[PDB]
Design a protein around this ligand. Structure first.
Ligand code: W1Y
Ligand code: CL
Ligand code: CL
Length: 163
């Protein structure tokens, strides 16, 4: 565990993270995909051996000794708002189980289902609150990675508001 477990946010490529493991915003078939998933495939391609896993689950594959936690959020194009919300919450609970099992002191995590799986909706608050619900009982330092300048400010505000 971290001595004073924290949340932080950085605006940069999660493939350049400074944490002990990474969460991939994976597809269920273990395909290279787009966005975060394509960057993770380019940096840790060995971690896509038998990485396929259902929606709402996380599966860890080692790249050398570096753990890649493949977390499959729902594609809100295909799910109802209600069912998608349940699967998005479930994916983050499985990430917390993996982070705990691995014994890491830090984890790099993207906001699941906020990009090409968002169904064209802004899901920053929905995805972030499911992240907190899952990770708050863990003692790893959590570093959230984003792309958008306005998202960085909104994530930073949500973190600071609970300190
Ligand atoms: C990196 N993608 C996250 C993101 C940024 N912006 N939005 C967004 C904003 C308004 C309406 C729909 C979607 C999602
Ligand atoms: Cl970058
Ligand atoms: Cl996404």
């Amino acid at each position: 565990g971290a001595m004073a477990p924290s949340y932080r946010v950085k605006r940069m490529d999660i493939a350049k993270n400074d944490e002990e493991c990474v969460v991939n915003a994976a597809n269920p078939r273990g395909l290279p995909g787009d966005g975060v998933c394509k960057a993770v495939y380019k940096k840790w391609p060995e971690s896509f051996k038998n990485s396929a896993t259902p929606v709402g689950t996380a599966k860890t594959v080692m790249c050398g000794t570096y753990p890649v936690i493949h977390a499959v959020g729902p594609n809100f194009s295909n799910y109802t708002e209600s069912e998608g919300d349940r699967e998005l919450a479930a994916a983050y609970r499985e990430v917390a189980k993996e982070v705990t099992r691995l014994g890491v002191n830090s984890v790099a995590i993207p906001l699941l289902s906020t990009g090409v799986y968002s169904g064209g909706k802004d899901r920053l608050t929905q995805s972030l609150n499911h992240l907190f619900t899952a990770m708050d009982s863990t003692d790893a330092d959590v570093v959230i990675y984003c792309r958008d300048k306005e998202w960085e400010k909104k994530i930073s505000e949500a973190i600071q508001m609970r300190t």
